[PDB]
Design a binder for this molecule. Structure first.
Ligand SMILES: Cc1ccc(C(=O)c2cc(O)c(O)c([N+](=O)[O-])c2)cc1
Ligand SMILES: Cc1ccc(C(=O)c2cc(O)c(O)c([N+](=O)[O-])c2)cc1
Lengths: 116, 116, 116, 116
């Protein structure tokens, strides 16, 4: 899996389960083309989004629906979502983990990029 | 100052100076309408973006040009930019500080929301 | 103010008010000698800890009583406290802001170091 | 493994490899007794620190030698180390992942605590 998304809850100290994630790729006309989507598992991880052959060079956007996560816990959070936009595979194929750490009024995101 | 943006550099341990930030309000057609912009000061701060009168309820986006910042420092960055999207003033007017802490492969954002 | 500590609450999106902070300097015997202390203000800030004269080179520790803060809010915390240990003034006197962003199961700390 | 430590580098977007970690447990006399140590693998993970039977209730300290990590990369970082202090197993045995995300002038730490 060349693209994985992991989401953690900094209030409970747990994986953030059942969080929707949507991936888009910038098209030649500069629009955001839907690329993949899913929801986080019990481990907070969203696997199986793409394959090495489909995950070509390009600019990708990962949008994590953090607002729905907090709202289901009774909380009205600050952010509408957490979005991560990045160029992928510019130097050849890589494996990307996009990790997000969520609090109601703050989030952090990191990328772990490895060479297979 | 109903809206302030502060940007910090976690590599140098300093304010992130001369970082462009652009503010948008979501339009009725779901498009992003540009609202205000500026460059961070020597303290990392972007002041004077809006006024109490103009900063009505709505969904707002702050886009921080983190890629140009890292490029100017000669450091390879992961993200194309950092975006913060939030609903403003849903329970009355508030003063918002959006703080962003930047590293080349990670960023975090927090909101400090105080009632005047 | 050679040394300032600022504490923010990522759950409420506010300064963390009335948080105790204690500052220590490492002694020749490697023990921690208490140096200064205070409680964060309504802006989350602990000012007036030390002076230019007293804040000589050395290794310093700031201990933030995060557990008492979360307990006062009725929220279960993970950490006993948050500690920040750093060598100060190794290349001349600097002004240090130690910023801590608190969640119940996570914290982050950053230093903003500026040369007067 | 009831206790795992994971360390990531936010500058390079990579696991932080070969980082020393030391674990201590608070003794009945209030001293810090050495409990386990190791170094992070190529995945940034330190496994095999303890067993469920040995990892009894108590207050534990995990000290990560972040300064040596940065110094080996040519960087003089702000922090001397990253230390995490927490009560473990107060409600029965749990599995703890202590994750640290490192930059030269900032770090963040989170706990992911799961029930086996
Ligand atoms: C680790 C971390 C991340 C974000 C914040 C943070 O949100 C913040 C907010 C401020 O109003 C402010 O003045 C500063 N500061 O000056 O350093 C930081 C504080 C700490
Ligand atoms: C404070 C912080 C923020 C983000 C990360 C982080 O990026 C990360 C990445 C992983 O692949 C991973 O498995 C975990 N984890 O399980 O805890 C965390 C690590 C620490």
């Amino acid at each position: 899996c060349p693209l994985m998304v992991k989401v953690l809850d900094a209030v409970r100290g747990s994986p953030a389960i059942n969080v929707a994630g949507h991936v888009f790729r910038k098209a030649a006309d500069d629009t955001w083309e839907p690329f993949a989507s899913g929801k986080t598992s019990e481990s907070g991880e969203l696997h199986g989004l793409t394959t090495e052959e489909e995950f070509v060079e390009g600019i990708y956007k990962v949008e994590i629906d953090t607002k729905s996560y907090w709202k289901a816990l009774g909380i009205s959070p600050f952010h509408e979502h957490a979005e991560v936009v990045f160029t992928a595979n510019d130097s050849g194929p890589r494996r990307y983990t996009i990790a997000a750490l969520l609090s109601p009024y703050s989030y952090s995101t990191t990328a772990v990029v490895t060479n297979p």
